[PDB]
Design a protein around this ligand. Sequence first.
Ligand SMILES: [Cu+]
Ligand SMILES: [Cu+]
Ligand SMILES: [Cu+]
Ligand SMILES: [Cu+]
Ligand SMILES: [Cu+]
Ligand SMILES: [Cu+]
Ligand SMILES: [Cu+]
Ligand SMILES: [Cu+]
Ligand SMILES: [Cu+]
Ligand SMILES: [Cu+]
Ligand SMILES: [Cu+]
Ligand SMILES: [Cu+]
Ligand SMILES: [Cu+]
Ligand SMILES: [Cu+]
Ligand SMILES: [Cu+]
Ligand SMILES: [Cu+]
Ligand SMILES: [Cu+]
Ligand SMILES: [Cu+]
Ligand SMILES: [Cu+]
Ligand SMILES: [Cu+]
Ligand SMILES: [Cu+]
Ligand SMILES: [Cu+]
Ligand SMILES: [Cu+]
Ligand SMILES: [Cu+]
Ligand SMILES: [Cu+]
Ligand SMILES: [Cu+]
Ligand SMILES: [Cu+]
Ligand SMILES: [Cu+]
Ligand SMILES: [Cu+]
Ligand SMILES: [Cu+]
Ligand SMILES: [Cu+]
Ligand SMILES: [Cu+]
Ligand SMILES: [Cu+]
Ligand SMILES: [Cu+]
Ligand SMILES: [Cu+]
Ligand SMILES: [Cu+]
Ligand SMILES: [Cu+]
Ligand SMILES: [Cu+]
Ligand SMILES: [Cu+]
Ligand SMILES: [Cu+]
Ligand SMILES: [Cu+]
Ligand SMILES: [Cu+]
Ligand SMILES: [Cu+]
Ligand SMILES: [Cu+]
Ligand SMILES: [Cu+]
Ligand SMILES: [Cu+]
Ligand SMILES: [Cu+]
Ligand SMILES: [Cu+]
Ligand SMILES: [Cu+]
Ligand SMILES: [Cu+]
Ligand SMILES: [Cu+]
Ligand SMILES: [Cu+]
Ligand SMILES: [Cu+]
Ligand SMILES: [Cu+]
Ligand SMILES: [Cu+]
Ligand SMILES: [Cu+]
Ligand SMILES: [Cu+]
Ligand SMILES: [Cu+]
Ligand SMILES: [Cu+]
Ligand SMILES: [Cu+]
Ligand SMILES: [Cu+]
Ligand SMILES: [Cu+]
Ligand SMILES: [Cu+]
Ligand SMILES: [Cu+]
Ligand SMILES: [Cu+]
Ligand SMILES: [Cu+]
Ligand SMILES: [Cu+]
Ligand SMILES: [Cu+]
Ligand SMILES: [Cu+]
Ligand SMILES: [Cu+]
Ligand SMILES: [Cu+]
Ligand SMILES: [Cu+]
Ligand SMILES: [Cu+]
Ligand SMILES: [Cu+]
Ligand SMILES: [Cu+]
Ligand SMILES: [Cu+]
Ligand SMILES: [Cu+]
Ligand SMILES: [Cu+]
Lengths: 120, 120, 120, 120
Amino acid sequence: GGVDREAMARCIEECLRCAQACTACADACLSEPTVADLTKCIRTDMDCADVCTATAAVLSRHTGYDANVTRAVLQACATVCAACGDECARHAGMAEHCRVCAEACRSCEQACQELLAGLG
Amino acid sequence: GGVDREAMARCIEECLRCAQACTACADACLSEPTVADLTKCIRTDMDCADVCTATAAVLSRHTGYDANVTRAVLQACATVCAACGDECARHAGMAEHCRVCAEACRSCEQACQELLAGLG
Amino acid sequence: GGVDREAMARCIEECLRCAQACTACADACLSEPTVADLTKCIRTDMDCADVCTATAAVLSRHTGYDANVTRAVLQACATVCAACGDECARHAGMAEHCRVCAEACRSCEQACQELLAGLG
Amino acid sequence: GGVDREAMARCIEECLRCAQACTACADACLSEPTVADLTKCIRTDMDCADVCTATAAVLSRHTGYDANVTRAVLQACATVCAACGDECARHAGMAEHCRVCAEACRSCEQACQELLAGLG
Ligand SMILES: [Cu+]
Ligand SMILES: [Cu+]
Ligand SMILES: [Cu+]
Ligand SMILES: [Cu+]
Ligand SMILES: [Cu+]
Ligand SMILES: [Cu+]
Ligand SMILES: [Cu+]
Ligand SMILES: [Cu+]
Ligand SMILES: [Cu+]
Ligand SMILES: [Cu+]
Ligand SMILES: [Cu+]
Ligand SMILES: [Cu+]
Ligand SMILES: [Cu+]
Ligand SMILES: [Cu+]
Ligand SMILES: [Cu+]
Ligand SMILES: [Cu+]
Ligand SMILES: [Cu+]
Ligand SMILES: [Cu+]
Ligand SMILES: [Cu+]
Ligand SMILES: [Cu+]
Ligand SMILES: [Cu+]
Ligand SMILES: [Cu+]
Ligand SMILES: [Cu+]
Ligand SMILES: [Cu+]
Ligand SMILES: [Cu+]
Ligand SMILES: [Cu+]
Ligand SMILES: [Cu+]
Ligand SMILES: [Cu+]
Ligand SMILES: [Cu+]
Ligand SMILES: [Cu+]
Ligand SMILES: [Cu+]
Ligand SMILES: [Cu+]
Ligand SMILES: [Cu+]
Ligand SMILES: [Cu+]
Ligand SMILES: [Cu+]
Ligand SMILES: [Cu+]
Ligand SMILES: [Cu+]
Ligand SMILES: [Cu+]
Ligand SMILES: [Cu+]
Ligand SMILES: [Cu+]
Ligand SMILES: [Cu+]
Ligand SMILES: [Cu+]
Ligand SMILES: [Cu+]
Ligand SMILES: [Cu+]
Ligand SMILES: [Cu+]
Ligand SMILES: [Cu+]
Ligand SMILES: [Cu+]
Ligand SMILES: [Cu+]
Ligand SMILES: [Cu+]
Ligand SMILES: [Cu+]
Ligand SMILES: [Cu+]
Ligand SMILES: [Cu+]
Ligand SMILES: [Cu+]
Ligand SMILES: [Cu+]
Ligand SMILES: [Cu+]
Ligand SMILES: [Cu+]
Ligand SMILES: [Cu+]
Ligand SMILES: [Cu+]
Ligand SMILES: [Cu+]
Ligand SMILES: [Cu+]
Ligand SMILES: [Cu+]
Ligand SMILES: [Cu+]
Ligand SMILES: [Cu+]
Ligand SMILES: [Cu+]
Ligand SMILES: [Cu+]
Ligand SMILES: [Cu+]
Ligand SMILES: [Cu+]
Ligand SMILES: [Cu+]
Ligand SMILES: [Cu+]
Ligand SMILES: [Cu+]
Ligand SMILES: [Cu+]
Ligand SMILES: [Cu+]
Ligand SMILES: [Cu+]
Ligand SMILES: [Cu+]
Ligand SMILES: [Cu+]
Ligand SMILES: [Cu+]
Ligand SMILES: [Cu+]
Ligand SMILES: [Cu+]
């Protein structure tokens, strides 16, 4: 009733974009010659993809809504997008794919934070 | 090497759109007064979301590509999209959400079939 | 280095048991004659399954560990297991499957809370 | 109606064990000094985890059962478990984690094949 439906739609779209960005980025870093130096990057992409996938699904459901569950899930997704954005940005100079993924992570972090702030 | 990269990108985009469409449609049918008549619809949406989520991830990875694995996953996703498209279309007259979801299912079925045809 | 490996293993096992319990319980309530009265139960089972699945995967990964990410994900999983345990317990008198699922939710809530408390 | 409920339960248990085994094995190979030689292994573990997760969910649902969907999902899971078992077995001598994971993959491949054989 107080919720911004536009911010909810933005969050769901960003979670799906960011899940796929991080799945692709984990795979792209796996195929880099410097893969041995990219292991935290790959791991954080895998976590970010898993949490964005779950968050998109939870936020897509309105039946028997529980703000406590939604808030806790958005907080988890904000936290991992923040971590994975920082990590991919550290490899921005190595490969465009990590620069691009850092942008996706930062965009989804913002969409989660904006929705979270408005749930009270 | 012989793969259509545009058809691969289309498949990944369609899997993510269709996963979310089916998650939302399962939830929408859950909230319908005639929910007791929509149980196969809700179940098939849940399967369709899970298989589209897995397929988008598998198709997003190029490292150590295996055509056997990719083909079998695309066949599963084509099969569930076909079934879930048929089921949601049965409720096209009841609610816009199922017509919309039927369109997403049929679109992703086609993207899986088009990519499958080109993998040999 | 400070982490309880036994509590970490318990959490991962409980997340996988609880994900499957809630997937089965969503489906079992969908097939109940009183399904119209079980819609919050089914929705909360779907969220609980999605978050337990993500949490099991995040907690299974040690490379480039980040306690902020792990803590936020465990908090989300504790919160949804608590909600889904409460909801399934409300239908304990209707069907053994919901009683059983309530027990699984409460067991995973405890395993998440116990691990969370020890991460500092 | 004709289905072996014991073989269905075995398949679901094996999918969840195998999903987690492959998630842990991807992470373990990520942390190996020879990670550059383990890239196909890590990728195949990621696919195997995603498909086992989806298969466990689909097989956990009985409402509006569709043998075509179930068969195609079990075929995908048998195919990726076979591929991931072969890949992890190649590193059986390098690390216990891959021998363990190879065993999980082979066990889940068998449970999928045994259930598939009985669905007609
Ligand atoms: Cu989101
Ligand atoms: Cu996200
Ligand atoms: Cu992402
Ligand atoms: Cu990348
Ligand atoms: Cu990357
Ligand atoms: Cu990276
Ligand atoms: Cu990365
Ligand atoms: Cu990421
Ligand atoms: Cu993410
Ligand atoms: Cu997200
Ligand atoms: Cu996120
Ligand atoms: Cu990242
Ligand atoms: Cu990258
Ligand atoms: Cu990256
Ligand atoms: Cu990213
Ligand atoms: Cu990334
Ligand atoms: Cu991310
Ligand atoms: Cu993200
Ligand atoms: Cu986000
Ligand atoms: Cu979000
Ligand atoms: Cu696709
Ligand atoms: Cu799809
Ligand atoms: Cu769909
Ligand atoms: Cu629906
Ligand atoms: Cu429906
Ligand atoms: Cu439906
Ligand atoms: Cu669907
Ligand atoms: Cu689908
Ligand atoms: Cu798909
Ligand atoms: Cu599909
Ligand atoms: Cu459907
Ligand atoms: Cu619908
Ligand atoms: Cu529908
Ligand atoms: Cu659909
Ligand atoms: Cu649908
Ligand atoms: Cu679908
Ligand atoms: Cu689909
Ligand atoms: Cu598709
Ligand atoms: Cu596809
Ligand atoms: Cu856990
Ligand atoms: Cu759990
Ligand atoms: Cu559960
Ligand atoms: Cu139940
Ligand atoms: Cu239930
Ligand atoms: Cu229930
Ligand atoms: Cu329930
Ligand atoms: Cu639950
Ligand atoms: Cu859960
Ligand atoms: Cu959990
Ligand atoms: Cu939980
Ligand atoms: Cu519950
Ligand atoms: Cu129940
Ligand atoms: Cu329940
Ligand atoms: Cu439960
Ligand atoms: Cu439950
Ligand atoms: Cu639960
Ligand atoms: Cu739980
Ligand atoms: Cu838990
Ligand atoms: Cu836990
Ligand atoms: Cu299985
Ligand atoms: Cu499996
Ligand atoms: Cu596995
Ligand atoms: Cu491994
Ligand atoms: Cu490996
Ligand atoms: Cu591996
Ligand atoms: Cu594997
Ligand atoms: Cu697997
Ligand atoms: Cu499986
Ligand atoms: Cu499998
Ligand atoms: Cu493997
Ligand atoms: Cu290994
Ligand atoms: Cu392995
Ligand atoms: Cu394995
Ligand atoms: Cu493995
Ligand atoms: Cu496997
Ligand atoms: Cu497996
Ligand atoms: Cu299996
Ligand atoms: Cu199986």
